[PDB]
Design an enzyme around this catalytic site. Structure first.
Site: not given
Ligand SMILES: Nc1nc2c(ncn2[C@@H]2O[C@H](COP(=O)(O)OP(=O)(O)OP(=O)(O)O)[C@@H](O)[C@H]2O)c(=O)[nH]1
Ligand SMILES: Nc1ncnc2c1ncn2[C@@H]1O[C@H](COP(=O)(O)OP(=O)(O)CP(=O)(O)O)[C@@H](O)[C@H]1O
Ligand SMILES: Nc1nc2c(ncn2[C@@H]2O[C@H](COP(=O)(O)OP(=O)(O)O)[C@@H](O)[C@H]2O)c(=O)[nH]1
Ligand SMILES: c1csc(CNCc2ccncc2)c1
Ligand SMILES: [Ca+2]
Ligand SMILES: [Ca+2]
Ligand SMILES: [Ca+2]
Ligand SMILES: [Mg+2]
Ligand SMILES: [Mg+2]
Ligand SMILES: [Mg+2]
Lengths: 438, 54, 322, 423
Positions: A224, A254
């Site tokens: 991980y 945006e």
């Protein structure tokens, strides 16, 4: 200056959030004790980095983040880890026992009893913002918390902050790095009730991150930690415009304006390059054209799919490092005459480009090599619907036998929510085919 | 092959290239959901205690 | 021990490959819905490529190239040839074709008519043929009015192309014919051409109406004093390379999470000038009865065993390219 | 701090439980007096899952010893690690159960159950966050079978949302104590089908065959059989007692192993099983761990299909080679895994191996082949019950024949439930 509050839900959200804020500190020169020498405005200031960091009177830069997990073992690493001093205790929230990979358990049983507490802590961060933009929510599809409590949080966040934007970084389930089996259920359950509340969601398929780590970094069995540092680079590239001076993707709104024309189709494909092994003797630094060409190789996409057989609806090019517009357009022209780039007829055939001169920051002693220039392409492709198909198929195989269904009903969920959620994914899959195929 | 909106600053720049022109549930309704599920859990658990008491 | 699933019970070809794989004692057939497979003999329509290459620890192969329909659909082929610079609109080996949508539905109706008028006024032969993909429905006519009216009466996309009025006739008999060539493209995108082809000759003046290359070649030597390699085969190999190299960037599985290979049936016409014309490309071709054995074995050898090896004088002609 | 409360009931239950605590105490570096003497911090990371901490850095198991007669527990209190168990957690009577399910469940056991729950209640009150319970017992006797299942029923009344796991020793005429074993086992299985979340089926017949044919033991003993159960119990609980990239608690295991609530009976397996210094490669571990001779349920997996499979690997080995072997076993026997549960075979690795083994493999399977175990029991049950043979031992304790008919029907239903999912 408008603030962004990050929200990290579940193990994957917390650990990925931990890897992003480690990178953010290195990118802005924030030491683990919260101090930042370059910041000459002590206690305040509305700079570009302040969108992600508040400032105390002592000169500490506190992340505008909240960590939430229904079990305290993952967040306890943050509390005693390298960056324990960055967050005050109110920012780290942990219940007593997890959702056991059960969506219903995290959404109903456990979520109901902790939801108001999380909203309160988030309201505390909001009360420090003069113009809050929105929220960035990091979570996994497969976890009971990451799927179940996130969809509840998104609902309540639309109530308390209706005018705010909400973006997701979602970890898509992959068998090679998961011991669970009901993740298809949780993925589809959480995508159904979260869909109308998410303005833009970046899916990262763990299968894609896993193979990039074995292929480019030569990690025989990535962990991980390997996957998170790589994922954090892509996250850093996407949020860079919010934290640094710039003009492209300057606020969360945006991202939707540029990347999402139709609301339900708000899952852009992400591509990052180059990923170079640090243990390499020494790599030949790739060019603007080379890395811009790599953005069309499936092998470095966050979701494995074939955009050659889909239709693009938008396309953002985010560059970091020694990159000038002249070299980008020269590479864009070259790629148009070689690649299969089929745009939708009701969208401009263009590319919004952004360049930040600060090259990618690599955590010392990590797996990624320091490169002089990199690029992350955000492209809204119908091809990403392959990931819904795969997932929907796994859902259909188990639901035809009602396997595991009793675990969800047992937590107060009605069986009908399964089929309601599945029929929504069926429609979503239809929306992608209406937009891409002829 | 056209370049529009070029913005330059000390930390980088951003522009746009075009190759071809074109051709909620309320707070109340959420409380019902959670409480509705909680009641179904209460009914099932009551039936278990009834089964056990028998 | 490799595994495969059969999802097209109507493929005469891969039914034999399915029959050969089991005969090797090293392949195991699974239910058509079992995802833990190495090789997929997929369905002709809606083959779910999206679910290929996502099973951990499994190298997966499929007998279809996603995107090859561009070449095997009548209208798609015409569009591909006209709009591809590698082929250009002046491509000398493809009959003049036009994509015409029925009036009950871009469309080249006006473009088709402009050329038609050019041939009519110029005393030139102006016989065309309309056809579509939803056929077993064809109409040959020298009047444009009949062609367009025949398409409107239908409801699917059609294409009109010049009917070859001067086809090379075999003798005796004075009979037309077409050439079938099978082409195999492997996961590496090597273009292999089966050494054997068949002619489907018309048993009417212009065994089993099938003539193989050996006989057809001997005729070309006695009648025309030439060979099948020089007069026709060079052009066929050129046309196959052009079509397949053109779409290669769009369908190549070189850097993909799964691998593809596919068997193609190219169909050619030959005129009285010994010029070769491309008619169509079949993506799910059948084989000549007398040729199933050799070709099906070659498929296993170069297409399947090359990726899943087992514990010559190749039957194929490698059309090398870049 | 995800504690488990361990309960062991009856002769078998206490003799297997005792050996279990002896084994894991060794793995966690705890001595017979309860003092830690290990060398790796991994031994104390999740130590609180099975041990409470006392003054002087002592570790006392969270175990309750239950029996209707004092004999077996006197052996435990005098055994190797007998001193380690909490004195107050020895709850026992004097009457015995005479291998009678009815006495353990209704008469003799009812008189003693409340005081067992007083100790369970005491242990649960000291847990930061109780995961659930595990019970070791046999099904063919009287206390572990009858009272054990009464305990489960009364614990469910008070901890309905906790997880209840059992290690249940199934009877076999090969290793038989009394002819009433099929009666007692059938009555217990009815309880278990409704009141347990995970039951590890340990067939005494399989354990005997392993000792005779694989271990080459001429005359196996209960002690020899219990060596295998100790090893298996340590294996299955590895992902709970040691740190790793897992984070596996009881509820998460149940959610991913149990697709249908009644089908929660598991086939455990272990490897190696040597008759001894040679290194065992990963391929050898993986091939053995799936062979029937290594499975403790006496059910041929080639007779049914796997719903879910969880394999645990212990030791320092190639985790790349582990993935290569497990993916090889699945893709080389895909006809024995249901294809309607995607990715139903998961693997976990652990650095700490069992004492005296460079590396081992523990196998946990939810296979429909377990139905053959319930068929054997049902057959032996019906042979006697059709003639009401030995029934008076139970009607004399207040039971009615109706209750036998119901237990029988439920188990045959259970068997029918496995058969439909095997198609
Ligand atoms: N990329 C990445 N994926 C992770 C990470 N941690 C967990 N996952 C993935 O997340 C899924 C498991 O869900 P979790 O996030 O651990 O579950 P949770 O949110 O903690 O919810 P619970 O069920 O209550 O534990 C699996 O598919 C894992 O592959 C991580 O750190 N990085
Ligand atoms: N433009 C043209 N000029 C001359 N002949 C033509 C022609 N178009 C088609 N033909 C004739 O029609 C036959 C091919 O028909 P077409 O291929 O369109 O139908 P089809 O696809 O159902 C048969 P197959 O796909 O198996 O080759 C050839 O034998 C050829 O002689
Ligand atoms: N594996 C194993 N089985 C046992 C042991 N002791 C008894 N059994 C089995 O358990 C059943 C007898 O039940 P028992 O535990 O003695 O009855 P109880 O004391 O009343 O609970 C028979 O099937 C025995 O074969 C043991 O130590 N190990
Ligand atoms: C997880 C969620 S519901 C559940 C059922 N548990 C049943 C039980 C039986 C006996 N004793 C205690 C509990 C487990
Ligand atoms: Ca400042
Ligand atoms: Ca909203
Ligand atoms: Ca008494
Ligand atoms: Mg968790
Ligand atoms: Mg055809
Ligand atoms: Mg006994």
């Amino acid at each position: 200056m408008r603030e962004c509050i990050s929200i990290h839900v579940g193990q994957a959200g917390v650990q990925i959030g931990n890897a992003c804020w480690e990178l953010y500190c290195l990118e802005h020169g924030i030491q683990p004790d919260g101090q930042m020498p370059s910041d000459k405005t002590i206690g305040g200031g509305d700079d570009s980095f302040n969108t992600f960091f508040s400032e105390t009177g002592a000169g500490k830069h506190v992340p505008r983040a909240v960590f939430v997990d229904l079990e305290p073992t993952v967040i306890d690493e943050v509390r005693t880890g390298t960056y324990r001093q960055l967050f005050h205790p109110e920012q780290l929230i942990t219940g007593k026992e997890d959702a056991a990979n059960n969506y219903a358990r995290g959404h109903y049983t456990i979520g109901k009893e902790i939801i108001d507490l999380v909203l309160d802590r988030i309201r505390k961060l909001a009360d420090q913002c003069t113009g809050l933009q929105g929220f960035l929510v990091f979570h996994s599809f497969g976890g009971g918390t990451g799927s179940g409590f996130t969809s509840l949080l998104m609902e309540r966040l639309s109530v308390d902050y209706g005018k705010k934007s909400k973006l997701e970084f979602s970890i898509y389930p992959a068998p090679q790095v998961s011991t669970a089996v009901v993740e298809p259920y949780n993925s589809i359950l959480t995508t159904h009730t979260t869909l109308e509340h998410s303005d833009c969601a970046f899916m990262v398929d763990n299968e894609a991150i896993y193979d990039i780590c074995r292929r480019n970094l030569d990690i025989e069995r990535p962990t991980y930690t390997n996957l998170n540092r790589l994922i954090s680079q892509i996250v850093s590239s996407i949020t860079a415009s919010l934290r640094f001076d710039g003009a492209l993707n300057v606020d969360l709104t945006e991202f939707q304006t540029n990347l999402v024309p139709y609301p339900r189709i708000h899952f852009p494909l992400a591509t990052y390059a180059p990923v170079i092994s640090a243990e390499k003797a020494y790599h030949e630094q790739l060019s603007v054209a080379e890395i811009t060409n790599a953005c069309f190789e499936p092998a470095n996409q966050m979701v494995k799919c074939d955009p050659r057989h889909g239709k693009y609806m938008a396309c953002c090019l985010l560059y970091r490092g020694d990159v000038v517009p002249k070299d980008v357009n020269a590479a864009i022209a070259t790629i148009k005459t070689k690649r299969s780039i089929q745009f939708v007829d009701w969208c401009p055939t263009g590319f919004k480009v952004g360049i930040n001169y600060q090259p990618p920051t690599v955590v010392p002693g990590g797996d990624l090599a320091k490169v002089q220039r990199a690029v992350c392409m955000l492209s809204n492709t119908t091809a990403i619907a392959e990931a819904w198909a795969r997932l929907d198929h796994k859902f259909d195989l188990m639901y035809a036998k009602r396997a595991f269904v009793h675990w969800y009903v047992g937590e107060g969920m009605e069986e009908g929510e399964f089929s309601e959620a599945r029929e929504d994914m069926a429609a979503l899959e239809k929306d992608y085919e209406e937009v891409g195929v002829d | 092959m056209e370049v529009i909106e070029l913005n330059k600053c000390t930390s980088g720049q951003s522009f746009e290239v075009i190759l071809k022109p074109p051709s909620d549930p309320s707070l109340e309704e959420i409380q019902k959901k959670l409480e509705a599920a909680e009641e179904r859990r209460k009914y099932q658990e009551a039936e278990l205690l009834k089964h056990l008491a028998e | 021990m490799y595994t495969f699933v059969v999802r097209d019970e109507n493929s005469s070809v891969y039914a034999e490959v399915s029959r050969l794989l089991l005969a090797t004692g090293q392949w195991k057939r699974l239910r058509k819905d079992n995802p833990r497979f190495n090789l997929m003999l997929g369905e002709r329509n809606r083959l779910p490529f999206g679910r290929l290459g996502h099973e951990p620890g499994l190298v997966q192969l499929v007998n279809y190239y996603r995107g090859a329909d561009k070449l095997c659909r009548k209208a798609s082929l015409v569009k591909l040839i006209k709009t591809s610079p590698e082929l250009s609109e002046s491509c000398t080996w493809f009959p003049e074709s036009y994509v015409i949508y029925p009036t009950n539905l871009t469309d080249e109706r006006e473009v088709f008519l402009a050329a038609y008028n050019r041939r009519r006024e110029g005393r030139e032969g102006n016989v065309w043929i309309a056809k579509s993909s939803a056929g077993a429905g064809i109409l040959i006519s020298s009047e444009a009015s009949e062609l367009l009216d025949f398409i409107d009466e239908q409801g699917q996309v059609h294409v009109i192309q010049k009917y070859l009025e001067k086809p090379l006739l075999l003798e005796p008999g004075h009979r037309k014919f077409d050439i079938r060539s099978w082409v195999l493209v492997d996961h590496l995108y090597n273009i292999y051409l089966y050494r054997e082809g068949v002619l489907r000759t018309s048993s009417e003046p212009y065994e089993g109406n099938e003539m193989f290359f050996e006989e057809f070649n001997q005729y070309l030597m006695d009648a025309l004093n030439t060979t099948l390699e020089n007069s026709i085969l060079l052009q066929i190999k050129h046309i196959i390379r052009s079509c397949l190299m053109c779409i290669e960037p769009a369908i190549s599985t070189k850097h993909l999470h799964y691998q593809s290979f596919q068997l193609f049936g190219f169909d050619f016409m030959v005129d009285e000038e010994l010029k070769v014309w491309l008619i169509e490309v079949n993506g799910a071709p059948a084989c000549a009865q007398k040729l199933y054995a050799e070709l099906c074995q070659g498929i296993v050898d170069v297409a399947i065993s090359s990726v899943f090896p087992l514990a010559p004088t190749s039957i194929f002609i490698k059309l090398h390219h870049h | 701090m995800r504690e488990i409360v361990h309960i062991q009931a009856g002769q078998c239950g206490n003799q297997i439980g005792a050996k279990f605590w002896e084994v894991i105490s060794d793995e966690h570096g705890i001595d017979p007096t309860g003092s830690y003497h290990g060398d790796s911090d991994l031994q104390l990371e999740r130590i609180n899952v099975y041990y409470n901490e006392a003054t002087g850095n002592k570790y006392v198991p969270r175990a309750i010893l239950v029996d209707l007669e004092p004999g077996t527990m006197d052996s435990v209190r005098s055994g190797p690690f007998g001193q380690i168990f909490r004195p107050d957690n020895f709850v026992f009577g004097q009457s015995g159960a005479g291998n009678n399910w009815a006495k353990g469940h209704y008469t003799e056991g009812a008189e003693l159950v409340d005081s067992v729950l007083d100790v369970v209640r005491k242990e649960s009150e000291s847990c930061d966050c109780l995961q659930g319970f595990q019970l070791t017992h046999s099904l063919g006797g009287g206390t572990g079978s009858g009272m054990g299942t009464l305990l489960i029923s009364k614990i469910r009344e008070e901890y309905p949302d906790r997880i209840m796991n059992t290690f249940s020793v199934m009877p076999s005429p090969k290793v038989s104590d009394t002819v009433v074993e099929p009666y007692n086992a059938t009555l217990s299985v009815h309880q278990l089908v409704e009141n347990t979340d995970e039951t590890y089926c340990i067939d005494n017949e399989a354990l005997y065959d392993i000792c005779f044919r694989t271990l080459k033991l001429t005359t196996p003993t209960y002690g020899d059989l219990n060596h295998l159960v100790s090893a298996t119990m340590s294996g299955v609980t590895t992902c709970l007692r040691f740190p790793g990239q897992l984070n596996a608690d009881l509820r998460k295991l149940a959610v991913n192993m149990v697709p249908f609530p009644r089908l929660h009976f598991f086939m455990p397996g272990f490897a190696p099983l040597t008759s001894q210094y040679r290194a065992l490669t990963v391929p050898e571990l993986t091939q053995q761990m799936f062979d029937s001779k290594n499975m403790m349920a006496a059910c041929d997996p080639r007779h049914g299909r796997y719903l879910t499979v969880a394999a645990i690997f212990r030791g320092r080995m190639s985790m790349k080679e582990v993935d290569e072997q497990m993916l090889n076993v699945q893709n080389k026997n895909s006809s024995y895994f249901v294809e309607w549960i995607p990715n139903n075979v998961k693997t976990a690795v652990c650095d700490i191996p069992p004492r005296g083994l460079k590396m081992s493999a523990t196998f946990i399977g939810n296979s429909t082949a377990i139905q053959e175990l319930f068929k054997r029991i049902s057959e032996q049950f019906t042979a006697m019950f059709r003639r009401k043979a030995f029934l008076h031992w139970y009607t004399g304790e207040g039971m009615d024949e109706m209750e036998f008919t119901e237990a029988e029907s439920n188990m045959n239903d259970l068997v029918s439930e496995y058969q439909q999912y095997q198609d």
